[PDB]
Design an enzyme around this catalytic site. Sequence first.
Site, mmCIF file in Angstrom:
data_model
loop_
_atom_site.group_PDB
_atom_site.id
_atom_site.type_symbol
_atom_site.label_atom_id
_atom_site.label_comp_id
_atom_site.label_asym_id
_atom_site.label_seq_id
_atom_site.Cartn_x
_atom_site.Cartn_y
_atom_site.Cartn_z
ATOM 1 N N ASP A 1 -1.585 9.579 -6.747
ATOM 2 C CA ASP A 1 -2.476 10.298 -5.869
ATOM 3 C C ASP A 1 -1.902 11.605 -5.558
ATOM 4 O O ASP A 1 -0.582 11.935 -5.578
ATOM 5 C CB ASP A 1 -3.172 9.790 -4.748
ATOM 6 C CG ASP A 1 -1.809 9.319 -3.700
ATOM 7 O OD1 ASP A 1 -0.629 9.352 -4.245
ATOM 8 O OD2 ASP A 1 -2.169 8.843 -2.742
ATOM 9 N N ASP B 1 -3.388 2.698 1.082
ATOM 10 C CA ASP B 1 -4.361 3.238 0.849
ATOM 11 C C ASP B 1 -5.706 2.299 0.884
ATOM 12 O O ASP B 1 -7.010 2.360 1.304
ATOM 13 C CB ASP B 1 -4.844 4.111 -0.295
ATOM 14 C CG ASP B 1 -3.942 5.373 -0.225
ATOM 15 O OD1 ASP B 1 -3.515 5.534 0.628
ATOM 16 O OD2 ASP B 1 -3.903 5.796 -1.435
ATOM 17 N N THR C 1 -7.664 11.591 -1.352
ATOM 18 C CA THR C 1 -6.875 12.796 -1.709
ATOM 19 C C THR C 1 -7.116 13.336 -2.936
ATOM 20 O O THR C 1 -7.006 14.668 -3.190
ATOM 21 C CB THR C 1 -5.441 12.453 -1.335
ATOM 22 O OG1 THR C 1 -4.908 11.533 -2.244
ATOM 23 C CG2 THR C 1 -5.265 11.920 0.120
ATOM 24 N N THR C 2 -7.655 12.630 -4.109
ATOM 25 C CA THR C 2 -7.590 12.882 -5.241
ATOM 26 C C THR C 2 -9.006 13.628 -5.366
ATOM 27 O O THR C 2 -9.167 14.680 -6.323
ATOM 28 C CB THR C 2 -7.626 11.718 -6.384
ATOM 29 O OG1 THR C 2 -6.424 11.097 -6.391
ATOM 30 C CG2 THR C 2 -7.892 12.001 -7.790
#
Lengths: 336, 536, 546, 520
Positions: C63, C402, C96-97
């Site tokens: 990520d 995550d 986040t990506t």
Amino acid sequence: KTSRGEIIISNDGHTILKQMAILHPVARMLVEVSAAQDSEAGDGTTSVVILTGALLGAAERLLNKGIHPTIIADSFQSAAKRSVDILLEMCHKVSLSDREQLVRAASTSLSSKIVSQYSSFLAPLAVDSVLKISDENSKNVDLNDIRLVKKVGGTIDDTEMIDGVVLTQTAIKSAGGPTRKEKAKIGLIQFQISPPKPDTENNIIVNDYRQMDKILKEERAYLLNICKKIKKAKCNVLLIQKSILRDAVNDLALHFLSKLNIMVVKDIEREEIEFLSKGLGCKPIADIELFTEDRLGSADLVEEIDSDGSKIVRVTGIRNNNARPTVSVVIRGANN
Amino acid sequence: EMGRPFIIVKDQGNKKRQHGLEAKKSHILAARSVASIIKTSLGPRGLDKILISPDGEITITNDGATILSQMELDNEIAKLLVQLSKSQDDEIGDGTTGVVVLASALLDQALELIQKGIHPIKIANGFDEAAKLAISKLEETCDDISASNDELFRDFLLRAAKTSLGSKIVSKDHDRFAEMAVEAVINVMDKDRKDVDFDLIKMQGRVGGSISDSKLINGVILDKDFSHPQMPKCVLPKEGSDGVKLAILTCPFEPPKPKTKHKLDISSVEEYQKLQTYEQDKFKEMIDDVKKAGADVVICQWGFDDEANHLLLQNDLPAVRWVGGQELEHIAISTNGRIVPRFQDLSKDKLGTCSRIYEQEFGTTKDRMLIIEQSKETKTVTCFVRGSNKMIVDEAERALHDSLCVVRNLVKDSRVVYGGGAAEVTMSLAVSEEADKQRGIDQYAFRGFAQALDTIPMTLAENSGLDPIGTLSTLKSKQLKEKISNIGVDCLGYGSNDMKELFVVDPFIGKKQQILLATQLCRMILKIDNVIISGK
Amino acid sequence: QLFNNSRSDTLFLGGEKISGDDIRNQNVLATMAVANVVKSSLGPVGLDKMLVDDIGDFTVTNDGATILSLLDVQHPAGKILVELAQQQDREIGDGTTSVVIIASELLKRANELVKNKIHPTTIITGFRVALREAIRFINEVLSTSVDTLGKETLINIAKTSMSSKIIGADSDFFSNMVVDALLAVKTQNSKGEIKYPVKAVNVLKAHGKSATESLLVPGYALNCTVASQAMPKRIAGGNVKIACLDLNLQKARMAMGVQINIDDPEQLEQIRKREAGIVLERVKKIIDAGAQVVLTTKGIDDLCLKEFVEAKIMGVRRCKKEDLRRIARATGATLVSSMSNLEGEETFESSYLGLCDEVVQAKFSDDECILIKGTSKHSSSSIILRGANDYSLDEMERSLHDSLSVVKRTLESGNVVPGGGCVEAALNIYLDNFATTVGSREQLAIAEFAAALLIIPKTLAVNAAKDSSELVAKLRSYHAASQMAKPEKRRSYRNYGLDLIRGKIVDEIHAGVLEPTISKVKSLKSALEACVAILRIDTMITVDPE
Amino acid sequence: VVFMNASQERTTGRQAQISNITAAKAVADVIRTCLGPKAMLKMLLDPMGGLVLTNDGHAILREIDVAHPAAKSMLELSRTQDEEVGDGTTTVIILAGEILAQCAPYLIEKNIHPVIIIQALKKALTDALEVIKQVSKPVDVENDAAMKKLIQASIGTKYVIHWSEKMCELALDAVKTVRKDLNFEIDIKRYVRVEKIPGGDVLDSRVLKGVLLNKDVVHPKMSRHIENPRVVLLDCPLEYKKGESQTNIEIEKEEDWNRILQIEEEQVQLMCEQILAVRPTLVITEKGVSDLAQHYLLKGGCSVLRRVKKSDNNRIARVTGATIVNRVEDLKESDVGTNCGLFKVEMIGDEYFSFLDNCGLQKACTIMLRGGSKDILNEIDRNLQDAMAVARNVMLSPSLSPGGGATEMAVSVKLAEKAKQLEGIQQWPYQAVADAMECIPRTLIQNAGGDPIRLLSQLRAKHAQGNFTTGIDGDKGKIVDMVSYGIWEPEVIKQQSVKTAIESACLLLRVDDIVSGVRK
Ligand SMILES: Nc1ncnc2c1ncn2[C@@H]1O[C@H](COP(=O)(O)OP(=O)(O)O)[C@@H](O)[C@H]1O
Ligand SMILES: Nc1ncnc2c1ncn2[C@@H]1O[C@H](COP(=O)(O)OP(=O)(O)O)[C@@H](O)[C@H]1O
Ligand SMILES: Nc1ncnc2c1ncn2[C@@H]1O[C@H](COP(=O)(O)OP(=O)(O)O)[C@@H](O)[C@H]1O
Ligand SMILES: [Mg+2]
Ligand SMILES: [Mg+2]
Ligand SMILES: [Mg+2]
Ligand SMILES: [Mg+2]
């Protein structure tokens, strides 16, 4: 981008000229022009710089035409004084408190600011902040009572007025006994909580092994007697100054306060007492003998809400209701 | 960048690029730096400027063409103004300082219009239409002086001469300079008062004496003296004569030799003795051909050997050596002679005729110079200038050179105007009047062109220590009350702002080019957007 | 780009100031340079990247949160997406990506909008008006958590977060571990509101065996070493008492800055013997209380070790402060900073001791950990990861971290949306007809906002080495017909997404791919604020350091 | 600007995959000669100057500095095999290096996505564990004669095979001494003590139960031979204790200073009287001993040893049964070491060595190894730890699997039958593991000097006949079964070797980019 690495994005022309280092001697005078505009009126710092540069361009062609510089300078001062009376006839007086004139003027003054799209709820925010302080003498309305606290994270849409004083620093949490406090009296401690020591160098000599048994008990008895007077006044919230010279908290003191479920927040700025004393309606207590119930205020809810990693301590409501209140607004945003 | 070097053009970091408002501000300020230099030298109250050359030589002049020519610059916008004054000096030769002030005045008024959001092409389109309205207005106001006879025609030449002689060093002698500049055209000109040849007038400077020694001499002035100076310096004609019978020869005096490389082989003493007699027979034959033709002074391009020094001394024939090829053309025009290629073609009809041939001592040593005079009106007029300084002898050349450029322009028919700032004020109010009728987006374009024309009269008031506001307001109020366009700025302060009583006269062809060179140059400058300047 | 501008002509600045379109062109290149990394890491077909510190150590991070954190970006506008990727971990914890790719695409397509001379306020308004209708559209298309009789949700919630990670093939095994770990650590506050203290689950690094054999610990596992080797390694029997003390058990100097002055030499020894005797007084109260395990934050001196071996007590030293707080609540013990009470006397009460089923210390691959299982008062959980090396477990540590944040959002808010480009593609058709109503100059800004969201579904096909057009063209066919599907379920046409493995368009509900609805709301609002701040910068001023 | 300061330029696509596969193959290529009983040796030069000569896989990898970042992950794979088991570290890299070598012509050629291959590697890993479980047979864990042949598996490669008959008796009694009933035997290497004594003969060695200390006696009168020794461990130093409070004494009277030194002598005498209460024959402490406390213990016959290693005291308490007590006031007869005997200090010119012999099930043993040189003695130490690690997995689980090329080929044959039945996109990556298991038996032939072409061709034909016991001989290279020669290895060694290779191959195939310059 500054020289130290700090990067500032500012619409206000004062910060643009202040953070930018100009090598020209006269061009730096425009930095202080926006300072006088921001200090007195606070609005129009960008326009006053443009008006100054426009008058220099108009007076530039006047130099080659044979007019003395003092004649040019005296002509602008005579024209500026006449321009004041021009705006005095066109302006219209308004009522003390009007929601129509104040809100529309606050949203218009924002203009190109990034909050113009957020001005829906922000325009009544700035109006209601000033309306809490009303005077017929048209005082400058000191903004020290209005505190804007910045918190990293969240969105600007979450920004709203807090009904009470907000604390920037978090709880000690070492003992962390109380999770949440309801109907608590917020105290103010200007002294230090520690084992007894003078503010100057002292010496303790132990001539017998039985003396150390009384030392460990009496050092804890001093911290115990402080908690006794606090429990008698039913003070569940304490606020202590930084106190860089003498330790403000102790592991033995936090354990005594954990049994009584007393929340304590330390590392508070010294200049913020005026905002804490007038906002919460609490008289600071600098001596254990002067501590009483009359100096303590009242608070409905004292809690610390952790939201998306951002921890904040807020207080809801003040039952004191002294002469004048204070304004507390928490600012949220995605980018610092 | 993605991590790889990105280079479109060689010398990437060396070249720089300018765009936007910063590119326009740098171009206007580049012209303001050149203007404020030229504005100080504009007008008869102006001041000269020292030009230091990289070789150490100095030059003192107020001429905008000479100052910018030797000026070493960097920015290319200021270099465009260099050829602006050069364009004015090469063709017309007058008003080189006015084209720089007028062009920068157009750029100063254009910068104010650019900040208002006007497209630069719309600014250039307004100056082109306003330039033709100013020329057509001044063309109707001027009158034709060709109706006067030759007696009054000389007066108009003296009027425009004294005006161009001002503003430059050694302006106290302008009274005599104006007389000598007109007499050169009176002698050399066509019978129809048209298309006079300027190349027939040569400018020869001399360093020494005083400025009061400058006088007109019709003839040829050479830097070479008489060869073998045993002969008299001043040559006089015979009692009765048709003339001096000046001879011009481009062939040196030598025994005939092939142009190709040759080898003469002498195989016996008898063949060598014949070369001895053949040698002296040619030098005796060459000197006899000149005596039989009646010629006196012989001019040789390559000179001659010392053998003929005494040979021409016996026959009393003056001779010069090492005369340049360009000077030989100047000699045959004055004496109306014909260059003789060889002795076999030498005849009495090809000999030139002049009044007297003599040399002057000039200073103490210096060098010997030959002077030729004419007995009547001829096609050759040589200017003779003296001075106590090398800088005075230099500037006086181009000072009278520009004065001759004004007179030759008056040879063109039916173009005259009156100077002293009266032309710019007349053409300024005509453009401002059209701005009210047109209106539209171009209304501000005619205002910028009208304010630019008033800069020249206001500049004249700066060097004279006057009020540019009070002077310009008087000229504008006079043109509105009365139609007389002859009122202008007086930098000499003799009173009578009427140019008719002050006699100041300027060529219209010179003033017409000032508007054309200034307007058409600003049209190209305003179109410049990306500026790519490579590192030296 | 092209040739550098002149340096402060008449401006008289000591630094570099560039104006015009060159600033906005370099601002796009700043977001495009940092995007090309995050781009190829999006989707289950994405590939991990390796970052090197030049010191010999490498870091494998999929990520863009840690990637942008490690990579140093000195560009002023480039730090916005760096702080945005670090931000996305704080609120939602996942995405986040996607937040970086969307925010970089909003600025990319807006670079051609400013060439139209359109002012950014028109561009910003076009993105905000389209966002207000986008957030409302997401709330209309959400699905309830009820679904069928059984749950059939939380198992599929984790499988979406396990994608793009090396353990994605094992997601079927790790699906039941993440769900059972969060339900054990749940708490209660705000008078009935259930909270989920993420990071309370201990993540341990072990070597050997395989990731498929990782066992879920029914309780908390403390990472530490045994004090003395003479202590019993395993403690059995029910009701195991655990003592958590924050007080130093080592011998400490008297007070802090005082001085000990002794006159009578006969008292020199007796005073020193008392200093060592006071420390053992607190241990005597612990031994008589029957505490089997003594947890101490700081170290333990040898004086206290001899009493634990004789009494068969397990001492533990050098404990983390945050680790003991979770042990106290789970086992039921009360954290004791010091021994004292309201009365002047000093004594230890048995109520401060916790209870559990068993305490055993496990040692695998040099990693020694005490397994605390069967907490009666409050349950807990721990996960022991097994992999190639420590750096191979570093990605597995953040992979499960995550997954804990995604399941938390589904339990708090039961509204979920399908993944695989369902939300990004559905917002396009909804904003196509909405832009035609407003018109004027805001129609092009809304149209480019809907096309900017297409970067997420198109990135899935590019990283899969397949044909992107045939997957996107068939994707729009269902969404374009979904708005016109019209009432009467027979509607269908919605909740369809790309299957990258099989290269077909199938229903994401039956495929087991779901994503929290709140993840879409916080991502679009955070990605827009990054683009708005960049579009508003006319001139960048860089001052050289002194 | 430069934007990213760390590797603004990027290498992505097939260029990053080739760099990861080529570097991973170079790690396994250097150790190819390190496999088999005929394997050669490798010498390593550290910046400190110490020379390490061994054929062990892990010892070679950890001492080599590899600048390639992805190849460093190959260096840590042997640490996983060494810490968890300790045997089979070489075959892990050879297998993992061959997988990526076999998996290379896919992304470049077949253009198969890595995750598609990963899904096939996980399915092939599950089927590989079943084949290893089927070929494994249980054996008696209490048979001493059966465990001696199992330790010879790892010894056959090592140089100690000449002493293997003697070395098996050393490793057998060492594991049996430290193990105890409780997770079954829960034996730990930390309880086994291996002391390296330069000089002597390897043929002459014995397993000593106790702790071998190199410290001499503190006093000459101390008896170096005790018939019935009694060990009492004390963490407190016999020197005069000083308070950390920095007590400053103000001396006024003339008798105050003389009394301070007397009280210091009385307490040292008092601490000796507390020790003499139980009358121990021996005294062992981990700190220094004052010269005053030595005389008071001479009357009671207490031999004192000072500056003993901290971890050695815990090993003394296991053999002697003594309880470590810091204060001398808590010393009791129960804390005194019992059942210990044969206390003797042998005189050797290099150092003084003390011996202990034992007669709460946890015990300890000290193996004295006598080599020909200090560096060879370091090799026997490493060979002894790997020999005892084989006996661990045998005692943990009864399962026992074949070795020497039989287990690796038994999996490859089963993978070939299922591959043709898949008929899908995963058929190509599923066949990569079948060809990857062939590197280990092929390497055994190349190091033996035989022809791998004809031997492996007939080897696969044997496994099709229904017998999984067909291996490859290390000396003659015969196809004779491993049951005759007796090669057998624990299943844990075979499982940890396959599991680590599959998990490592999936890590490097997912790296599409390599960037540097971060400097965290
Ligand atoms: N004696 C004079 N009286 C009035 N005006 C003059 C006089 N001399 C020059 N001027 C004015 O000054 C301007 C500039 O003349 P000058 O500087 O002498 O040469 P140039 O025209 O080449 O610049 C002319 O346009 C002319 O009208
Ligand atoms: N099994 C799947 N099939 C199709 N698309 C998926 C699948 N799993 C995840 N995705 C898509 O990949 C995107 C990124 O998911 P994820 O990797 O969990 O977040 P991030 O990329 O931020 O780590 C999501 O928007 C989702 O739509
Ligand atoms: N005499 C032999 N014949 C056939 N195979 C052997 C012989 N000796 C050893 N081997 C095999 O060679 C391998 C080498 O083992 P070793 O070097 O101890 O560790 P690694 O297996 O990690 O290389 C063993 O797995 C064993 O099966
Ligand atoms: Mg404003
Ligand atoms: Mg002139
Ligand atoms: Mg994710
Ligand atoms: Mg081995």
